[PDB]
């Protein structure tokens, strides 16, 4: 193999096989030193190590591996494919990064809030290798990037227009107002016309390099799509407002420039692992010995006083929340340092260990106190060996219990010392599957009719339905028949015995011939099921991601937070879901913005997955252009300074002085709103800001709009609060939006509107202010409710006062009925229906809201209200009096409310499966505490799984009746508890 030394010297080496030939660094070093006195001189001045580069596709690649030459099989395969026997490898000096690179890295660190280059809490190079490996998708997305559409990021959907919106088009025409300087002209256009056609019509109705931008917002109506397919156009149609656009010059694509990538490409880590024949290094499948681990001891500087006098260690081998084997140590007195030095031998073979298996070490007292996880197979298909001293996590099913990260608090957490068996040669797990040539003896005989019926019934069941041993055996024995039905994939793969190598090989053969799945229609619930905690195998995840790859940008935006949370379920840092999220955030600007904020919140608040999300955020930030970087920097600056001011105020006219200090110093002239990238906030209306009379003391801030083209002088309401976790609020609001879309596809407009919520840091966040909205508790306290006495006419009189005319009042009543029904159904399904008046808001137009979901979500998870009087949802006598005449018999408005809520309940029951998987993900990810069964099953009990539509309708009517039974009792109890 030809080598180029750094003096363009060409030294001809030879192919030295693949057995421990990574000493080629030393071999070439010695060859250069002997063949050149200059190399001998530079040996005293050169860096510690050098690099290997070659030409894959014109771009420089790097051999980033110091273990074996079998990893370098990719460059050899490329060289043979190109038919170039003498291969060229260049050595490059390990140049330190330049000052500009260091400054860019510091800027990225400031944006992320976590130091990705720190290696003080890692025992391997998985995160660094993930950083090196995320370059190729980033460069692929940057290369295949259309500059104009990326700069302008049109927001379009391909769904048909809703019936209530399709009817709203008066005469199959849409009025658009185009503003040019001070001139305003209204043009009538058909809903099936592209914006280019509208622009051409406007120009003919008197240069051509112009576009339509929404007045007062950073949204462009461009691209080749009908005007009715724009999300802002649909938003304006739904609200009945006029569509105002301005003729603006297109934004410069040069502002989205991305600086050149500084690292060479890293290839893949699958080179080290080959087929079973190639690896029989030592093949993992050759070792038939049982797995064994030594628990050396337990160390803790300060003993907790929670529980003592007895302690032991439990070692579990699990693959996707299924414990393959379980071993325990002899209990010992609970003191500062406990010593065992005992080998725990499991009944599972070493060859049968599946990739993604987790060694779960837990400390029990006498109940579970500390836990820590260790991935048995590392990212490079190698079994873990040697000493490991892991700092454990302290508990205060959960996604936090699956993390392979170590506790960063080295000086205060409990530490466990373990030992794993060592070997002379590294043990490498062979490749997943060479080829499905034998077909694994696919079944030929047709299933008996009764067995076919049993299999169909098993497939038709809900995701939460447990599978018996007979059910699993039937699913596996007829796997090739179950492939024809994509709905059976989660159940088919739940019946796989992952603790046997041969069964895993059969499963890999089975999924190597997936065609019915490939052409199958994209089902969101099924794919999210395949990404849950119950699937730790990489190939099932890849299948789910490749199905997700056919989504559109709006569809991804609907489920972006859920996928970000599901990244936690990935056993390894460099997963297909991470690549998919990075690619879709680099493709679209809105997706990138929301992904940045969602990921930064998790970095700030979740220590278990800080490093992985930090690496993903680094990849995205390097991918995006400099305009996005500047906007992110401005947003982070304003967020940090508002956080500091919130801290100072919470420590205690002072707010006015501090806001004046901010406005004249370091406050950016304009910043993008984190929960609405299309809106830019400018100066701060200090004379309107205040501090609300709440226990958390949030900041009521109002910013002026930074766009001069805005049609209104209305400010931008922003609430900054500290001491509450807004992540649960974001999850609840996202699920509300998903249910709103589900109702939309069934011609149901429940008037349920979620507000803007973004968590910006540790227990801080930003809340959108809904204008002209007040709280039901305040409405009561205006007349009666300060002392606890309650009246029914207060809400009706308040709505009557805010309505100038009778038609406005009737519209307000209709909106109140629809919003109340929608929120009742949504909160009953989600289990957050038992709230107090202080967390329910209402506008002057009648719309109803539920706020502060984090306050009630944790309380309901901890208590479930089984020890109190729980109501399914807030159907308060004031609501009934607003709806009907409160005659306790019926009313046309009450009948309409009952009908629409039953319709919404049946609509949600139509997508029970997706709702169930969303609820499960929400519980296991968004809950700081530990959940289990009987809590996940709440949704399948509330969604009335396995019952008729009439039975479900009767059940929901019974829930309404029991709400009507307890009129003021629950509200009075809440008042007494709070007071």
């Amino acid at each position, epitope marked *: 193999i030809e080598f180029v030394l750094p003096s363009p010297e060409t030294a001809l080496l030879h192919v030295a096989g693949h057995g421990n030939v990574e000493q080629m660094k030393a071999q070439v070093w010695l060859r250069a030193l002997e063949t050149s006195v200059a190399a001998d001189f530079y040996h005293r001045l050169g860096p510690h190590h050098f690099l290997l580069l070659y030409q894959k596709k014109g771009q420089w690649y790097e051999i980033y591996d110091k273990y074996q030459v079998v990893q370098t099989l990719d460059c050899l395969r490329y060289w043979k494919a190109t038919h170039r026997s003498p291969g060229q490898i260049h050595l490059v000096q390990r140049h330190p990064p330049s000052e500009e690179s260091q400054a860019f890295q510091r800027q990225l660190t400031a944006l992320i809030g976590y130091d990705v280059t720190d290696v003080s809490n890692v025992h391997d190079d998985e995160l660094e290798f993930t950083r090196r490996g995320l370059v190729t998708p980033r460069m692929a997305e940057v290369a295949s990037r259309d500059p104009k559409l990326y700069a302008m990021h049109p927001w379009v959907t*391909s*769904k048909p227009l809703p019936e209530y919106l399709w009817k709203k088009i008066a005469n199959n025409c849409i009025f658009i107002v185009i503003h040019r300087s001070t001139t305003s002209q209204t043009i009538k256009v058909s809903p099936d016309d592209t914006p280019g056609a509208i622009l051409q019509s406007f120009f003919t109705k008197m240069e051509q390099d112009f576009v339509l931008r929404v007045c007062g917002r950073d949204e462009y109506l461009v691209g080749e799509t009908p005007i009715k397919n724009f999300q802002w156009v649909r938003h304006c149609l739904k609200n009945g407002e006029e569509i105002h656009v301005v003729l603006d010059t297109p934004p410069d694509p040069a502002l989205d420039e991305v600086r050149k990538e500084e690292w060479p490409l890293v290839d893949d880590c699958t080179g080290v692992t080959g087929y079973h024949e190639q690896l029989t290094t030592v093949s993992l499948w050759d070792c038939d010995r049982k797995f064994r681990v030594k628990i050396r001891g337990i160390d803790i500087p300060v003993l907790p006083r929670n529980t003592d006098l007895t302690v032991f260690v439990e070692a579990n081998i699990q693959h996707g929340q299924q414990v393959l084997c379980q071993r325990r140590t002899s209990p010992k007195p609970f003191t500062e340092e406990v010593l065992w030095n005992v080998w725990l031998e499991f009944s599972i073979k070493i060859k049968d260990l599946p990739k993604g298996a987790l060694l779960n070490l837990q400390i029990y007292c006498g109940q579970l106190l500390y836990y820590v996880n260790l991935l048995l197979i590392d990212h490079r298909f190698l079994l873990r060996r040697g000493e490991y001293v892991l700092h454990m996590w302290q508990i205060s099913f959960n996604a936090d219990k699956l993390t392979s990260a170590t506790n960063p608090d080295k000086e205060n957490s409990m530490s466990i010392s373990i030992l794993l068996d060592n070997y002379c040669h590294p043990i490498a797990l062979p490749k997943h599957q060479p080829t499905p040539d034998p077909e694994g003896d696919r079944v030929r005989a047709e299933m008996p009719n009764q067995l*076919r019926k049993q299999l169909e019934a098993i497939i038709a069941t809900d995701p939460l339905n447990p599978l018996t041993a007979e059910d699993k055996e039937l699913l596996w024995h007829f796997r090739y028949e179950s492939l024809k039905h994509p709905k059976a994939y989660p159940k088919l793969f739940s019946s796989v015995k992952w603790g046997q190598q041969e069964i895993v090989a059969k499963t890999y053969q089975l999924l190597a011939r997936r065609e019915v799945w490939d052409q199958s*229609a*994209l089902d969101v619930g099924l794919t999210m099921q395949l990404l849950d905690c119950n699937f730790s195998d990489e190939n099932v995840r890849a299948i789910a991601v490749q199905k997700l790859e056919s989504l559109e940008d709006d569809d991804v935006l609907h489920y972006l937070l859920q996928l970000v949370q599901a990244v936690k379920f990935e056993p390894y840092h460099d997963s297909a879901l991470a690549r998919f999220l990075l690619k879709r955030g680099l493709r679209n600007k809105r997706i990138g913005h929301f992904l940045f904020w969602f990921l930064r919140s998790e970095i700030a608040q979740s220590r278990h997955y800080q490093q992985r999300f930090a690496v993903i955020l680094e990849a995205y930030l390097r991918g995006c252009g400099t305009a996005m970087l500047h906007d992110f920097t401005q947003q982070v600056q304003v967020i940090e300074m508002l956080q500091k001011v919130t801290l100072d105020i919470k420590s205690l006219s002072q707010l006015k002085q501090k806001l004046e200090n901010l406005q004249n110093s370091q406050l950016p002239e304009s910043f993008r709103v984190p929960y609405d990238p299309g809106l830019k906030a400018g100066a701060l209306a200090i004379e309107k800001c205040k501090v609300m009379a709440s226990k958390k003391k949030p900041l009521w801030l109002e910013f002026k709009c930074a766009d001069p083209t805005a049609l209104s002088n209305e400010t931008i309401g922003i609430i900054f609060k500290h001491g509450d976790d807004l992540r649960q609020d974001m999850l609840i609001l996202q699920i509300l939006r998903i249910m709103e879309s*589900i109702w939309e*596809t*069934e011609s149901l407009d429940l008037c349920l509107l979620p507000y803007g919520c973004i968590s910006t840091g540790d227990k801080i966040g930003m809340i959108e202010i809904v204008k002209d909205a007040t709280t039901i508790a305040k409405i009561q306290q205006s007349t009666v409710g300060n002392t606890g006495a309650f009246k029914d006419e207060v809400l009706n009189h308040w709505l009557k006062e805010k309505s100038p005319t009778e038609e406005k009042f009737q519209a307000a009543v209709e909106r109140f009925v629809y919003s109340c029904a929608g929120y009742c159904v949504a909160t009953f399904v989600l289990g957050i229906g038992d709230r107090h008046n202080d967390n329910i808001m209402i506008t002057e137009t009648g719309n109803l809201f539920h706020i502060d979901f984090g306050h009630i979500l944790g309380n309901y998870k901890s208590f479930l209200g089984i020890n109190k009087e729980r109501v399914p949802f807030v159907l308060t006598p004031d609501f009934l009096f607003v709806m009907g005449t409160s005659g306790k018999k019926t009313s046309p408005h009450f009948q309409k409310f009952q009908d629409i809520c039953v319709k919404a309940y049946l609509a949600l029951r139509h997508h029970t499966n997706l709702l169930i998987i969303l609820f499960s993900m929400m519980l296991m990810t968004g809950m700081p505490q530990l959940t289990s069964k009987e809590d996940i099953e709440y949704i399948r009990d509330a969604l009335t799984v396995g019952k008729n539509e009439e039975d479900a309708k009767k059940y929901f009517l019974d829930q309404i009746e029991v709400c009507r039974d307890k009129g003021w009792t629950v509200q009075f109890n809440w008042f007494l508890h709070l007071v």
Partner: nanobody
Amino acid sequence: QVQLVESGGGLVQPGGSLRLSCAASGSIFSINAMGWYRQAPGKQRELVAHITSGGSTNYADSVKGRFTISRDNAKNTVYLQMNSLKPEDTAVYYCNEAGDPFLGSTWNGPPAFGSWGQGTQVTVS
């Protein structure tokens, strides 16, 4: 293998009506949403009518108010009822397993199925 056979098409005058039927050979028909696709001459195939396993119906904008889709899980057959036919409705109509109604990717373009049947020809003239 899932097999679908479409029937009911033919020549009809403008303003007329037609009723298509299609029988599916998939025995899990009960839990699968189905939809009707049409391929205009020199045009890509597009979903026009969507029905869920429960029975909720969603239609494309062009065919809204004139097309009605129904299913019978007992006979594993899906019916599409056309009213007030217009010349642009002339296309080859197909039925298959549709997708998610609220997903925009389903309404986007060809759903990349590999089990398309023969279809039926509808001509309005």
